[PDB]
């Protein structure tokens, strides 16, 4: 009785009533409850994971001989979680000079991959020359048999995305099932960077090819970084690719799709500053990603909105 | 300023006002998802049949079974009218949907005499086939009610196989706009306060909401509204 309701735990007139347990009965537990055991939820935090590497790990496997031999050259290149500020010109000079002296293929290529990664972080454009000078001959040209070491490919790809470069499309294509079959070994961050670059450059077709492979190779869709999905989708103006992207959008999860919308509305919105290159206007893809989000969320009832104009009829 | 649409009214024009948040059975606020882009019989209006649905068989399975048949898997054609069926799904057999209820109650012998092929045992795989995948579904419910253990419906069936566009029944997605008053069969008196209150049957029904929902293309959706914007009959705060 009142506008303030009784709280059923603290009130003995609830607790001890006939619909609950009186204090003179024997007070044991009624039934056991196993909730967590029967059907358990997987852990997904609202906050992203604080320790994760957040980059493209380039996997440095060197024989612990050349690793010691080449140390004064390698000390200038990135080691794990450490990014020395050495100017990229110098590093490339060192590779060009000293590398023909080393005899190992595997070593020369690990070293090269480090150089590429280093040049990806500084966004120096003259590093593809290195690909055409050493690797192109035995990997990409005229159906050469040789199969490049994975780390090298990851590194070059990462470089083509960081420095936006038409070249990526040629490399990526070699990684599908009939080629090197490297695509299932890519990191989630790899996909993230790829999508973002392709999106900036604006290839709907690059975007489609990449989303198809990602899906087939079972990438982690929900953990692909939202910004990069948005920038990729934003690039899609062509009727067919557009169709593809609706049908595809159904592959994300409820949550992912909600934040695809949030992120999208921010990047053309308040957070338009957050990007190094501003987005381009897609009103169509924006509207659609919002629409999709609305379709996939639970629906709420707002009767004064729906039935605002309802009039009954006696027909 | 204010009017019947905007003000609080228990009743508007002699019938319960649907605009009041408190005129609905609270159950109507519980969360639900849009159906409409899903297969016809998964939708919520068919809920009485939901316990009966059939495990699917996709186009891939169908082509595979064309080239590599299994002895005791039966592919059963449910197409009803002979006028519409010009091709033969490989290794199939014909039990038209209309006959099923009768057919499945024949003895092995009698069934042999009426349809000219052996009646599948209840262990065997039975794949059902139709134009759209609707009649095959209904037939499936029949086969499942006699208890047949493996009954698969191939939706999109003969249309996908042969690239024909035909339909088993003529049913359209659009609901005819609701005609009379709100049905007294949906009116729900409350048990504690004895208070009459609306339900989502009738002129208020989720079908109608999904039907008129915003189109999923900005251009086609902007075409639907006047220049200034989508809802201008409402006060700003109701938009």
């Amino acid at each position: 009785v009142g506008y303030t309701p009784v709280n059923p735990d603290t009130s003995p007139m609830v607790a001890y009533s006939q619909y609950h347990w009186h204090y003179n009965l024997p007070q044991g537990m009624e039934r056991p409850h196993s909730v967590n055991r029967t059907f358990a939820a997987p852990f997904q935090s609202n906050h992203s994971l604080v320790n994760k590497y957040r980059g493209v790990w380039i996997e440095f496997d060197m024989h612990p001989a050349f690793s010691v031999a080449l140390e004064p050259q390698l000390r200038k290149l990135p080691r794990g979680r450490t990014l020395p500020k050495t100017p990229a010109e110098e590093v490339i000079a060192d590779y060009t000079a000293l590398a023909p002296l080393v005899d190992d293929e595997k070593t020369r290529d690990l070293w090269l991959a480090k150089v590429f990664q280093h040049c990806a972080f500084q966004r120096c454009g003259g590093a593809m020359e290195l690909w055409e000078r050493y690797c192109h001959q035995r990997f990409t040209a005229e159906g050469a048999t040789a199969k490049p070491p994975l780390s090298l490919v990851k590194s070059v790809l990462f470089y083509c995305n960081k420095t936006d470069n038409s070249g990526w499309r040629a490399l990526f294509d070699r990684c599908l099932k009939d080629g090197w079959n490297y695509t299932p070994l890519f990191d989630t961050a790899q996909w993230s960077f790829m999508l973002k670059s392709i999106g900036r450059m604006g290839d709907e077709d690059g975007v489609r090819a990449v989303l198809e492979e990602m899906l087939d190779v079972q990438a982690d869709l929900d953990r692909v970084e939202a910004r990069s999905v948005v920038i990729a989708l934003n690039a899609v103006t062509n009727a067919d690719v557009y169709e593809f992207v609706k049908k595809y959008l159904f592959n994300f999860g409820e949550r992912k799709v909600k934040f695809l919308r949030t992120t999208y509305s921010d990047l053309r919105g308040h957070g338009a500053g957050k990007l190094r290159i501003p987005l381009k206007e897609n009103d169509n893809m924006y509207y659609h990603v919002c629409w999709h989000s609305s379709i996939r969320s639970p629906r709420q009832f707002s009767p004064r909105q729906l039935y605002f104009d309802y009039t009954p009829s006696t027909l | 300023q204010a009017d019947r649409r905007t003000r609080h009214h228990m009743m508007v024009d002699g019938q319960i006002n649907p605009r009041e948040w408190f005129n609905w059975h609270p159950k109507e606020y519980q969360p639900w998802y849009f159906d409409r882009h899903k297969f016809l019989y998964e939708q919520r209006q068919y809920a009485q049949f939901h316990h009966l649905l059939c495990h699917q068989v996709y186009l891939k399975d169908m082509l595979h079974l064309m080239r590599y048949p299994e002895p005791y898997t039966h592919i059963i054609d449910c197409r009803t009218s002979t006028q519409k069926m010009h091709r033969w799904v490989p290794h199939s057999l014909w039990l038209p949907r209309d006959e099923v209820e009768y057919a499945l109650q024949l003895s092995a012998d009698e069934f042999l005499d009426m349809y000219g092929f052996r009646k599948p045992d209840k262990s065997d795989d039975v794949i059902l086939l139709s134009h759209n995948g609707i009649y095959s579904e209904q037939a499936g419910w029949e086969w499942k009610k006699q208890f047949f253990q493996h009954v698969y419906n191939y939706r999109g069936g003969t249309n996908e196989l042969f690239g024909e566009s035909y339909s088993d029944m003529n049913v359209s997605d659009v609901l005819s706009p609701w005609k009379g008053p709100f049905p007294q069969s949906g009116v729900f008196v409350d048990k504690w306060s004895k208070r009459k209150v609306l339900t989502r049957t009738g002129p208020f029904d989720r079908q109608y909401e999904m039907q008129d929902f915003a189109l999923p293309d900005l251009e086609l959706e902007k075409a639907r509204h006047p220049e200034e914007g989508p809802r201008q009959n409402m006060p700003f705060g109701l938009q």
Partner: peptide, 21 residues
């Protein structure tokens, strides 16, 4: 709101197979 996307074209899936055979 349906249809969300353009339905698959009329393509005939049985013919190519039985033609190969």
């Amino acid at each position: 709101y349906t249809p969300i996307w353009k339905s698959d074209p009329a393509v005939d899936n049985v013919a190519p197979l039985r033609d190969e055979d």
